[PDB]
Subunit: 114 residues, 4 copies
């Protein structure tokens, strides 16, 4: 039950649809704040109570702005009434070769159905 | 630039196409790990980079299941393309596996790959 | 306020002393992993932080060898202390194991721990 | 094998002493960033490694403050030492700065460094 609307604590929001083939498509977010998303998930997880692996990408360019960057989220989906997606991310900005060593940030996030 | 065939330091093969819309589609084949044959990838990239010599931000995802195997896991690559005499794509990765609640502390690997158009 | 006994979300115990000019010393007990009993740690912290409401940066290291067991591994924790009603330390970690050079692509785990005194 | 002078591709230098008790002590001097001069380092390493051809696990920390400048930030390195005719230390790092609560999601950078005896 990944298909739907998810929320984090800092006010961001995303709507996804999960395909039977393992595809993930949606938008991350006013129009000025919407971005395309795309990803993949394991459409045949284990039955031993492990979570379902997935990930997705967003570049921070739309018809109105371009921050010259992209983020990837990597983590897992856990069902139940407390259904959540736990992730860790990587955010990279384009840079001159001299400044590449400080081009990527790392962090974590949790999304809920409510 | 980005469209084409790439090889990393491990002998893996990354075949990709860059759309005019900022979309990334293709196929991935790994030399290491619980995998065999090709897998579907999808990603995004900045289709209008700055002009000051900076790199082009990009990223993509792979879920390790196909018609031969399933490893119950997925990897995301996050990086930048740099044009030049020697074109290359430098990245960092996060590899997450499906675990129980108890072992989630050891579910994610972190690493770094460098892709190049010549096979080393 | 860094000196003292802290605990994390998994059950691990971290006991620290902060020296007058940047030293960090103490022991760690992990509630999980191939571990058993106490281990030595050592680290550093910012001894003159900004006075505009930002946190205090620090880090520390542990190697998993003691008189009872050795996992041939090490962890590093990077983060910041925040003072207040609920003093907390927010970190991220890297845990590297020794491998052959062919398995090096899978040597290092990544995650995060939050410590409190409750 | 570890005690001595090491160099990275960026132009930075570090001098380290590896103790018989598993400690790492020394000095670091960067070439890139908000820093000038020497800074203190401290760490730990596996003092009874295996010989199946695995490497030796280690880690260390620097806080970016000395008698000349303060950068309100800290770095930890975690990785492994590899013997051989071309010895080296392969690592990944976490660099964290002091921030307020609102900029906490963008406080930590990640990267990798290779050190040789050159
Ligand atoms: O074993 C698995 O769980 C799936 C295979 C993972 C292969 C990884 S992805 C990061 C690194 N780069 C590669 O080309 N292969 C490995
Ligand atoms: O190599 C081992 O098995 C021992 C690792 C110790 C467990 C880890 S270290 C990061 C995380 N925080 C903890 O308190 N425990 C785990
Ligand atoms: O606070 C700063 O801006 C300076 C920190 C030092 C720069 C980094 S630490 C990781 C990497 N390795 C180096 O030798 N220099 C950079």
């Amino acid at each position: 039950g990944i298909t739907g609307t998810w929320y984090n604590q800092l006010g961001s929001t995303f709507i996804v649809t999960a395909g039977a083939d393992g595809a993930l498509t949606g938008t991350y977010e006013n129009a000025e704040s919407r971005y395309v998303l795309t990803g993949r998930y394991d459409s045949a997880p284990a039955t031993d109570g492990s979570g379902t692996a997935l990930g997705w990408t967003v570049a921070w360019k739309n018809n109105y702005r371009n921050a010259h960057s992209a983020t990837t989220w990597s983590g897992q989906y856990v069902g139940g009434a407390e259904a959540r997606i736990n992730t860790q991310f990587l955010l990279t900005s384009g840079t001159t070769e001299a400044n590449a060593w400080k081009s990527t940030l790392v962090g974590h996030d949790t999304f809920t159905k409510v």
